[PDB]
Amino acid sequence: KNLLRNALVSHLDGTTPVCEDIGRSLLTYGRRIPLAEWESRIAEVDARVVREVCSKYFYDQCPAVAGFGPIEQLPDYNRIRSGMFWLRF
Amino acid sequence: GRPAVSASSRWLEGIRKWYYNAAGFNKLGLMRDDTIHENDDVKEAIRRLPENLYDDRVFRIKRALDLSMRQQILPKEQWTKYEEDKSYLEPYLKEVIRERKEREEWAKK
Amino acid sequence: NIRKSHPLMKIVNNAFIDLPAPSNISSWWNFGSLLGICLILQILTGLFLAMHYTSDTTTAFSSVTHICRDVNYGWIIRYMHANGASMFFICLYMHVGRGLYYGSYTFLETWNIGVILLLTVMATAFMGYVLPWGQMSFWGATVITNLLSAIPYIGTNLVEWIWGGFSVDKATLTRFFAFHFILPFIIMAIAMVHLLFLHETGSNNPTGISSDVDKIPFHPYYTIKDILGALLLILALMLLVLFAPDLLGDPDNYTPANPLNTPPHIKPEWYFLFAYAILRSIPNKLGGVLALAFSILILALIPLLHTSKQRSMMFRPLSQCLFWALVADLLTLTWIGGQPVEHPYITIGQLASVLYFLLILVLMPTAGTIENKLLKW
Amino acid sequence: MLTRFLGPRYRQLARNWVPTAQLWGAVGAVGLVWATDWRLILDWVPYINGKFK
Amino acid sequence: AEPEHDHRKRMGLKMLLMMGLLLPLVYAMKRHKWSVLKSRKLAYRPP
Ligand code: HEM
Ligand code: HEM
Ligand SMILES: C[C@@]1(c2ccc(Oc3ccccc3)cc2)OC(=O)N(Nc2ccccc2)C1=O
C-alpha cells in the first residue's frame, strides 16, 4: 500500500506528469480523481482484498506468454498453465 | 575422358528418381542430407556448415519432426523435388572423411 | 518446491518429469513403460500367489488349485499372472521390433542390456511355467533342460547339476521356485541400468533424425500418453483373464504328473514357437540347440550389420519390405512350431529357418547398401 | 524455541489455511470411510444402504 | 472345473463397461494436453 502511495505522489511531481494525468484521466475516468480518493481506495485494501482480487485475475487462469531469445529452457505452455493453480489449495 | 549421354543413364536416373520418391523424406520437406545418420564424421560436418545452411537444416528438420508427430505431410506442391535437392552436406562430409583417413594412415607407420 | 535439488526427486525429475523427449515419438515407443508395468504386474500377483503356493512335488499342482478354488480371488490373481506373462512377451516382441525397424539398436549399450533383459525374462518365464507341475510344465521342463546336454564334453554333468539328480524331479521344482522368485528382482536392477544408459542420449524417433531441435518435456505429454497406453495394456490383459483364461493355456497342464508318459503332441507356450521351429528344423542334436541359441543371440549381431547411411527405415522402401518379410517369416515359424514334425511342415520349417537367418545376416544389409547407392550417397 | 513461528503474520497465515486444512480432512475422512466401507459411519447415509437391515 | 465362471463374467462385464467409460475419457485428457502441440504453428524468419 505504502509503495503505491509513494509512487502515486512521487510521480505527479512537476507540470508535465500532472498535465499528462489531467489530460488522460479525463479521457479514461471522465473526471480527475483527486489524491485522497486514491488514498481512500488504497486504504480499503487489506490482505483479504489482495487474496480475492488476485485469485479472480490470476487463479487457474490461462496466461498469454511471449518469449524472445535463448528460450529453449522456457517451460512448456501446459507447464506454465499448471503453475497458475496450486494443488494444495 | 568424357562424351556419352545414354537413354540408359536416364533409366538409371529414372530408377533413382523413382526410389527418391518412394523414400518419401521429400514429403516432409526434408532434403537428402537432412536424413543422414549423425556419426562423428557427420557431427563435425554439421559443425562446419555456414550459418545460413546450418540454420536452414535446423528449420527443415523441425518442420519434419513436427509433421511426423501429426503424421501429416506437406502439400504435394511443396515436396522437395529430386534434382532441386542440394547436396549441401556432402563436400564438408567428404573433407572430414579425408582428414580422418589421413590421420589413420599416419597412425599405421 | 523443488524436484530438482532433493537427491531423490532429482532422479525422478530427470527420468519422468523434465527429461527432454522427442516431440514425435510414436505408439511404438509406449512399450518400454508397458514392459515396466508388466514387470511390476508380474511382481505383485506373483508375490500373492507365493503366499499360497507350495514348492513340493506332491502338493504343487494341488496348491495352485487351492488358489483357484479356495483362496479368495486367487483365480483372478492367478490368471493375471499367467496372462501377464504373455503380455510381457507381447511387449518384448513389439519393443525389439521397434528397435530394429527404427535403428534404435545403434545405442549399443542400451540395446545390449535389452538382450540381457530378454534372456533374463525368458529364463524367468521358463522356470515359472514349470511350477504347477502339470504335464506340459514337466515335459516342457524336460525338453528345454536337456538342451544343455548337447554341449560337448560337459553337457551331461551340467543337466544333472541343474537337475540335482538323474532327471527333472523334486530338487528341480524347488530350485526353480527359488530362481523364479529372485530373477524379476535382478531383472528390475538391469532395467534401471537399461534406463540409465538410454538417458545418456535420450530417445530415438520414427525419422532416425536428431530431435534436439524439437524436444518436449516428458511431463504432461508422455505422462498422459503412457497412462492412456497402460489402460490399453490393461484392457487387453483383462479380456484374457476375464473372458479367455484358458486360451493360450495348454489343456494338458490341467493333469498332474507323468514322468512315465509324454503327451502325444507337446506344444510350447506361444512365444517360444518360432524358436522351437528353428531348433526342430535341423535334424541334429548339437546343431539344433546351436541354431536355437543363435536364433536369439543374433540380436547382438544386428548392430554390426547396419549398412545404411540412414538410421530409421522410415525412408527406406526396400528395407521395409524385407522387415515385414522377416515378421511374416516369424509368424510362419510360429505356426510351424505349433505343428507336428511331418511332411509339409518340416520342409516349410526348414526354409523359413534359412530365411530368418538369410534375411538378417545377408538380405537386410544388402538392401541397405543398394538403398545407399540408389541415393548417390 | 518454536517461538520463531509465534507472531501476528504466522497467525494470519494459520487462518488463511484453516479452510483448506479443514477441507482436506473432509476429503480424508470421506475417503477412508468409503475405502473400508465403514459400516459404522456409512449406515447413516440415506442411499448406500446396500447392507439392507 | 471352473467354479469362478459366473463371477468372472460379471466382473468381465464391469471391465468392458468401465473400460468403455475410462478409455474415451483418458483419451480426451491426453488430447487436451497435446492440443498445444497439435495445433502449434511454425515460421522461419532468417535475416
Ligand atoms: C515377483 C517375482 C515372481 C514371483 C514371486 C512369482 C511367483 C510365481 C508362483 C508362486 C507361480 C506358481 C503358481 C502358479 O502357477 O500360478 C508362478 C508361475 C508363473 N509365473 Fe511367476 N513369479 C514372479 C515373476 C514372474 C515373471 C517375471 C514371469 C515372467 C513374465 C512370470 C511368469 C510366470 C509364469 C508363466 C508362471 C507359470 C504360470 C501358470 O501357468 O501357472 N512370473 N510364479
Ligand atoms: C525388462 C525388459 C525391458 C524393459 C523393462 C525395457 C524398458 C525400456 C524403457 C522404459 C524405454 C524408454 C522408451 C521406450 O518406451 O522405448 C526403452 C527404450 C529402449 N530399449 Fe528397452 N526395455 C526392455 C527390453 C529391451 C530389449 C529386449 C531391448 C533390445 C534387445 C531393448 C533395447 C531398447 C532400446 C534400444 C531402446 C531405445 C529407445 C528408442 O530407440 O526408441 N530393451 N526400454
Ligand atoms: C513356457 C515355456 C517356455 C518359456 C520360456 C522359454 O524361453 C524362450 C522363449 C523364446 C525363445 C527362447 C527361449 C521357452 C519355453 O516353458 C515350458 O515348459 N514350455 N513348454 C515347452 C513345450 C515343448 C517344448 C519345450 C517347452 C514353454 O513353452
mmCIF file of C-alpha atoms in Angstrom, chain C residues 27-270:
data_model
loop_
_atom_site.group_PDB
_atom_site.id
_atom_site.type_symbol
_atom_site.label_atom_id
_atom_site.label_comp_id
_atom_site.label_asym_id
_atom_site.label_seq_id
_atom_site.Cartn_x
_atom_site.Cartn_y
_atom_site.Cartn_z
ATOM 1 C CA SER C 27 2.869 -45.511 -30.020
ATOM 2 C CA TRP C 28 5.665 -47.867 -30.758
ATOM 3 C CA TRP C 29 7.582 -46.060 -28.027
ATOM 4 C CA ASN C 30 4.920 -46.891 -25.368
ATOM 5 C CA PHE C 31 6.197 -50.461 -24.898
ATOM 6 C CA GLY C 32 9.143 -49.705 -22.632
ATOM 7 C CA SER C 33 6.905 -48.285 -19.930
ATOM 8 C CA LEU C 34 4.477 -51.160 -20.630
ATOM 9 C CA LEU C 35 7.346 -53.573 -20.058
ATOM 10 C CA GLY C 36 7.837 -51.812 -16.691
ATOM 11 C CA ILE C 37 4.193 -52.119 -15.861
ATOM 12 C CA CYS C 38 4.405 -55.787 -16.880
ATOM 13 C CA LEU C 39 7.266 -56.378 -14.508
ATOM 14 C CA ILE C 40 5.502 -54.716 -11.652
ATOM 15 C CA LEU C 41 2.316 -56.636 -12.559
ATOM 16 C CA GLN C 42 4.183 -59.937 -12.502
ATOM 17 C CA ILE C 43 5.798 -58.890 -9.226
ATOM 18 C CA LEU C 44 2.595 -58.106 -7.257
ATOM 19 C CA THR C 45 0.446 -61.036 -8.434
ATOM 20 C CA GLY C 46 3.485 -63.245 -8.445
ATOM 21 C CA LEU C 47 4.031 -62.407 -4.772
ATOM 22 C CA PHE C 48 0.413 -63.009 -3.642
ATOM 23 C CA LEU C 49 0.487 -66.356 -5.431
ATOM 24 C CA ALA C 50 3.647 -67.133 -3.346
ATOM 25 C CA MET C 51 1.694 -66.582 -0.144
ATOM 26 C CA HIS C 52 -0.317 -69.701 -1.059
ATOM 27 C CA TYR C 53 1.711 -71.882 -3.451
ATOM 28 C CA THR C 54 3.855 -74.730 -2.123
ATOM 29 C CA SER C 55 7.001 -75.995 -3.868
ATOM 30 C CA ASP C 56 6.889 -79.720 -3.114
ATOM 31 C CA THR C 57 6.296 -82.325 -5.836
ATOM 32 C CA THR C 58 3.166 -83.698 -4.173
ATOM 33 C CA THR C 59 1.219 -80.567 -3.225
ATOM 34 C CA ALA C 60 2.463 -78.276 -6.064
ATOM 35 C CA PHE C 61 -0.315 -78.939 -8.609
ATOM 36 C CA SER C 62 -2.706 -79.051 -5.668
ATOM 37 C CA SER C 63 -1.801 -75.758 -4.024
ATOM 38 C CA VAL C 64 -2.384 -73.937 -7.298
ATOM 39 C CA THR C 65 -5.915 -75.402 -7.362
ATOM 40 C CA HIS C 66 -6.291 -74.433 -3.740
ATOM 41 C CA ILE C 67 -5.679 -70.858 -5.005
ATOM 42 C CA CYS C 68 -8.148 -71.060 -7.879
ATOM 43 C CA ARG C 69 -10.941 -72.592 -5.788
ATOM 44 C CA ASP C 70 -10.355 -71.841 -2.129
ATOM 45 C CA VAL C 71 -8.331 -68.643 -1.697
ATOM 46 C CA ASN C 72 -10.333 -65.501 -2.086
ATOM 47 C CA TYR C 73 -9.859 -64.195 -5.572
ATOM 48 C CA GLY C 74 -6.872 -66.385 -6.179
ATOM 49 C CA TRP C 75 -8.342 -67.244 -9.585
ATOM 50 C CA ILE C 76 -8.202 -63.619 -10.703
ATOM 51 C CA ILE C 77 -4.684 -63.202 -9.333
ATOM 52 C CA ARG C 78 -3.505 -66.484 -10.872
ATOM 53 C CA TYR C 79 -4.884 -65.564 -14.335
ATOM 54 C CA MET C 80 -3.451 -62.073 -14.258
ATOM 55 C CA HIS C 81 -0.067 -63.646 -13.557
ATOM 56 C CA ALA C 82 -0.360 -66.194 -16.465
ATOM 57 C CA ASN C 83 -1.823 -63.706 -18.898
ATOM 58 C CA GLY C 84 0.663 -61.095 -17.665
ATOM 59 C CA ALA C 85 3.482 -63.409 -18.778
ATOM 60 C CA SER C 86 2.066 -63.481 -22.261
ATOM 61 C CA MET C 87 1.616 -59.690 -22.396
ATOM 62 C CA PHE C 88 5.210 -59.298 -21.174
ATOM 63 C CA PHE C 89 6.331 -61.250 -24.271
ATOM 64 C CA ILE C 90 3.947 -59.407 -26.485
ATOM 65 C CA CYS C 91 5.638 -56.295 -25.282
ATOM 66 C CA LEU C 92 9.202 -57.645 -25.594
ATOM 67 C CA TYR C 93 8.439 -58.517 -29.223
ATOM 68 C CA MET C 94 6.995 -55.135 -30.232
ATOM 69 C CA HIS C 95 9.840 -53.345 -28.271
ATOM 70 C CA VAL C 96 12.543 -55.361 -30.016
ATOM 71 C CA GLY C 97 10.803 -54.934 -33.381
ATOM 72 C CA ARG C 98 10.506 -51.158 -32.859
ATOM 73 C CA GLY C 99 14.275 -51.031 -32.179
ATOM 74 C CA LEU C 100 15.089 -52.947 -35.364
ATOM 75 C CA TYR C 101 12.807 -51.056 -37.686
ATOM 76 C CA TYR C 102 13.830 -47.654 -36.324
ATOM 77 C CA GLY C 103 17.548 -48.339 -35.912
ATOM 78 C CA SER C 104 17.398 -47.878 -32.122
ATOM 79 C CA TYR C 105 19.978 -50.607 -31.677
ATOM 80 C CA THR C 106 22.567 -48.044 -32.553
ATOM 81 C CA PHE C 107 22.522 -47.104 -28.831
ATOM 82 C CA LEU C 108 24.948 -50.001 -28.263
ATOM 83 C CA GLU C 109 24.868 -50.276 -24.511
ATOM 84 C CA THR C 110 21.218 -49.887 -24.009
ATOM 85 C CA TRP C 111 20.446 -52.374 -26.777
ATOM 86 C CA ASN C 112 22.950 -54.878 -25.382
ATOM 87 C CA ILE C 113 21.353 -54.523 -21.955
ATOM 88 C CA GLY C 114 17.984 -55.149 -23.599
ATOM 89 C CA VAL C 115 19.207 -58.524 -24.935
ATOM 90 C CA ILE C 116 20.244 -59.442 -21.431
ATOM 91 C CA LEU C 117 16.790 -58.338 -20.262
ATOM 92 C CA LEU C 118 15.322 -60.534 -22.985
ATOM 93 C CA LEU C 119 17.223 -63.669 -21.913
ATOM 94 C CA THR C 120 16.502 -62.949 -18.255
ATOM 95 C CA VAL C 121 12.756 -62.857 -18.746
ATOM 96 C CA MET C 122 12.819 -65.934 -20.948
ATOM 97 C CA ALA C 123 14.740 -67.693 -18.196
ATOM 98 C CA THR C 124 12.219 -66.382 -15.762
ATOM 99 C CA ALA C 125 9.113 -67.484 -17.691
ATOM 100 C CA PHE C 126 10.523 -70.951 -18.280
ATOM 101 C CA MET C 127 11.064 -71.571 -14.507
ATOM 102 C CA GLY C 128 7.654 -70.095 -13.875
ATOM 103 C CA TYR C 129 5.790 -72.384 -16.236
ATOM 104 C CA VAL C 130 7.241 -75.496 -14.609
ATOM 105 C CA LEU C 131 5.932 -74.501 -11.172
ATOM 106 C CA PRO C 132 2.370 -76.052 -11.297
ATOM 107 C CA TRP C 133 3.910 -79.449 -12.187
ATOM 108 C CA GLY C 134 1.426 -80.162 -14.966
ATOM 109 C CA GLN C 135 2.142 -82.453 -17.892
ATOM 110 C CA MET C 136 3.458 -79.690 -20.165
ATOM 111 C CA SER C 137 5.150 -77.984 -17.256
ATOM 112 C CA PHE C 138 7.020 -81.294 -16.684
ATOM 113 C CA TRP C 139 7.749 -82.257 -20.313
ATOM 114 C CA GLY C 140 8.472 -78.714 -21.364
ATOM 115 C CA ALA C 141 10.822 -78.637 -18.359
ATOM 116 C CA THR C 142 12.326 -81.859 -19.653
ATOM 117 C CA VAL C 143 12.827 -80.664 -23.209
ATOM 118 C CA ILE C 144 14.356 -77.302 -22.509
ATOM 119 C CA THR C 145 16.595 -78.550 -19.740
ATOM 120 C CA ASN C 146 18.022 -81.306 -21.974
ATOM 121 C CA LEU C 147 19.286 -78.665 -24.482
ATOM 122 C CA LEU C 148 22.226 -78.148 -22.210
ATOM 123 C CA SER C 149 23.048 -81.857 -22.616
ATOM 124 C CA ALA C 150 24.109 -81.107 -26.251
ATOM 125 C CA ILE C 151 27.096 -79.094 -25.052
ATOM 126 C CA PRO C 152 30.188 -81.229 -25.771
ATOM 127 C CA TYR C 153 32.221 -82.916 -23.029
ATOM 128 C CA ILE C 154 30.496 -81.196 -20.065
ATOM 129 C CA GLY C 155 26.933 -81.435 -21.352
ATOM 130 C CA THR C 156 25.652 -84.170 -19.045
ATOM 131 C CA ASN C 157 27.346 -83.218 -15.774
ATOM 132 C CA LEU C 158 25.608 -79.867 -16.337
ATOM 133 C CA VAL C 159 21.984 -81.046 -16.869
ATOM 134 C CA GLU C 160 22.323 -83.442 -13.935
ATOM 135 C CA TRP C 161 23.754 -80.495 -11.998
ATOM 136 C CA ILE C 162 20.879 -78.229 -12.894
ATOM 137 C CA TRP C 163 18.533 -81.137 -12.127
ATOM 138 C CA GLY C 164 20.077 -82.055 -8.783
ATOM 139 C CA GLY C 165 19.533 -85.640 -9.830
ATOM 140 C CA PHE C 166 19.087 -88.064 -12.763
ATOM 141 C CA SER C 167 16.039 -86.281 -14.275
ATOM 142 C CA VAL C 168 13.642 -83.386 -13.626
ATOM 143 C CA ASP C 169 12.433 -84.254 -10.124
ATOM 144 C CA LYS C 170 11.765 -82.898 -6.590
ATOM 145 C CA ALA C 171 15.027 -80.941 -6.386
ATOM 146 C CA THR C 172 14.340 -79.106 -9.647
ATOM 147 C CA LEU C 173 10.782 -77.945 -8.811
ATOM 148 C CA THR C 174 12.073 -76.379 -5.568
ATOM 149 C CA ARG C 175 15.096 -74.622 -7.092
ATOM 150 C CA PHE C 176 13.002 -73.377 -9.978
ATOM 151 C CA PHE C 177 10.635 -71.775 -7.407
ATOM 152 C CA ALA C 178 13.591 -70.051 -5.837
ATOM 153 C CA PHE C 179 15.299 -68.812 -9.019
ATOM 154 C CA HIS C 180 11.891 -67.752 -10.392
ATOM 155 C CA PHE C 181 11.314 -65.542 -7.288
ATOM 156 C CA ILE C 182 14.694 -63.764 -7.420
ATOM 157 C CA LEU C 183 15.044 -63.347 -11.196
ATOM 158 C CA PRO C 184 12.470 -60.496 -11.563
ATOM 159 C CA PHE C 185 14.268 -58.504 -8.818
ATOM 160 C CA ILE C 186 17.562 -58.941 -10.693
ATOM 161 C CA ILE C 187 15.646 -58.006 -13.930
ATOM 162 C CA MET C 188 14.484 -54.856 -12.211
ATOM 163 C CA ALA C 189 18.050 -53.806 -11.496
ATOM 164 C CA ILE C 190 19.165 -54.455 -15.136
ATOM 165 C CA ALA C 191 16.184 -52.404 -16.324
ATOM 166 C CA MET C 192 17.295 -49.390 -14.212
ATOM 167 C CA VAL C 193 20.728 -49.758 -15.764
ATOM 168 C CA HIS C 194 18.958 -50.009 -19.174
ATOM 169 C CA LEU C 195 17.168 -46.697 -18.428
ATOM 170 C CA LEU C 196 20.416 -45.115 -17.253
ATOM 171 C CA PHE C 197 22.279 -45.821 -20.490
ATOM 172 C CA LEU C 198 19.248 -44.640 -22.509
ATOM 173 C CA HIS C 199 19.109 -41.250 -20.743
ATOM 174 C CA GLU C 200 22.669 -40.626 -21.713
ATOM 175 C CA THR C 201 21.340 -39.919 -25.246
ATOM 176 C CA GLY C 202 17.591 -39.769 -24.772
ATOM 177 C CA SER C 203 15.096 -41.415 -27.043
ATOM 178 C CA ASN C 204 15.376 -42.010 -30.845
ATOM 179 C CA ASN C 205 12.337 -41.355 -33.067
ATOM 180 C CA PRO C 206 10.445 -42.505 -36.183
ATOM 181 C CA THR C 207 12.647 -40.421 -38.570
ATOM 182 C CA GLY C 208 16.009 -41.562 -37.259
ATOM 183 C CA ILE C 209 16.996 -37.860 -37.325
ATOM 184 C CA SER C 210 18.097 -35.999 -34.115
ATOM 185 C CA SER C 211 15.237 -34.352 -32.292
ATOM 186 C CA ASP C 212 17.375 -31.878 -30.167
ATOM 187 C CA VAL C 213 15.731 -29.071 -32.067
ATOM 188 C CA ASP C 214 12.311 -30.172 -31.107
ATOM 189 C CA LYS C 215 12.415 -31.730 -27.657
ATOM 190 C CA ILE C 216 9.401 -31.575 -25.282
ATOM 191 C CA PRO C 217 9.235 -32.354 -21.613
ATOM 192 C CA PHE C 218 8.317 -35.833 -20.718
ATOM 193 C CA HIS C 219 5.832 -34.233 -18.343
ATOM 194 C CA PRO C 220 2.440 -33.554 -19.220
ATOM 195 C CA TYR C 221 2.882 -35.280 -22.668
ATOM 196 C CA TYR C 222 4.393 -38.713 -22.180
ATOM 197 C CA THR C 223 2.988 -38.869 -18.774
ATOM 198 C CA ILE C 224 -0.507 -38.905 -20.221
ATOM 199 C CA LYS C 225 0.464 -40.829 -23.388
ATOM 200 C CA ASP C 226 1.846 -43.559 -21.042
ATOM 201 C CA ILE C 227 -1.258 -43.539 -18.852
ATOM 202 C CA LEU C 228 -3.578 -43.980 -21.820
ATOM 203 C CA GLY C 229 -1.379 -46.764 -23.123
ATOM 204 C CA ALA C 230 -1.268 -48.516 -19.727
ATOM 205 C CA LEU C 231 -5.062 -48.669 -19.753
ATOM 206 C CA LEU C 232 -4.822 -50.352 -23.169
ATOM 207 C CA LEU C 233 -2.384 -52.899 -21.807
ATOM 208 C CA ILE C 234 -4.875 -53.459 -19.018
ATOM 209 C CA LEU C 235 -7.932 -53.971 -21.276
ATOM 210 C CA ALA C 236 -6.036 -56.495 -23.357
ATOM 211 C CA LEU C 237 -4.862 -58.249 -20.127
ATOM 212 C CA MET C 238 -8.342 -58.355 -18.600
ATOM 213 C CA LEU C 239 -10.030 -59.571 -21.781
ATOM 214 C CA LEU C 240 -7.835 -62.666 -21.439
ATOM 215 C CA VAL C 241 -8.210 -63.056 -17.651
ATOM 216 C CA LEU C 242 -11.935 -62.371 -17.714
ATOM 217 C CA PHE C 243 -13.147 -63.872 -20.934
ATOM 218 C CA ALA C 244 -10.457 -66.270 -22.129
ATOM 219 C CA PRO C 245 -8.448 -67.546 -19.119
ATOM 220 C CA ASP C 246 -7.644 -70.735 -20.977
ATOM 221 C CA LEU C 247 -6.854 -69.727 -24.482
ATOM 222 C CA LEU C 248 -3.126 -69.633 -24.545
ATOM 223 C CA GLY C 249 -3.026 -72.177 -21.754
ATOM 224 C CA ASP C 250 -2.469 -75.785 -22.864
ATOM 225 C CA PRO C 251 -5.139 -78.263 -21.615
ATOM 226 C CA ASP C 252 -2.500 -80.810 -20.523
ATOM 227 C CA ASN C 253 -1.233 -78.798 -17.525
ATOM 228 C CA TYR C 254 -4.604 -79.495 -16.026
ATOM 229 C CA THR C 255 -3.355 -83.092 -15.488
ATOM 230 C CA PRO C 256 -0.692 -83.729 -12.830
ATOM 231 C CA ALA C 257 2.449 -85.745 -13.190
ATOM 232 C CA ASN C 258 3.747 -88.265 -15.606
ATOM 233 C CA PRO C 259 7.475 -88.827 -15.729
ATOM 234 C CA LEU C 260 6.450 -92.099 -17.281
ATOM 235 C CA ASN C 261 4.192 -90.733 -20.006
ATOM 236 C CA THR C 262 4.946 -87.976 -22.512
ATOM 237 C CA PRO C 263 1.839 -86.429 -24.127
ATOM 238 C CA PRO C 264 1.302 -87.264 -27.838
ATOM 239 C CA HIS C 265 1.952 -83.746 -29.167
ATOM 240 C CA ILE C 266 3.720 -81.464 -26.700
ATOM 241 C CA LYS C 267 3.290 -77.833 -27.603
ATOM 242 C CA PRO C 268 5.306 -74.838 -26.335
ATOM 243 C CA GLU C 269 3.558 -71.813 -24.833
ATOM 244 C CA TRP C 270 3.319 -69.485 -27.787
#
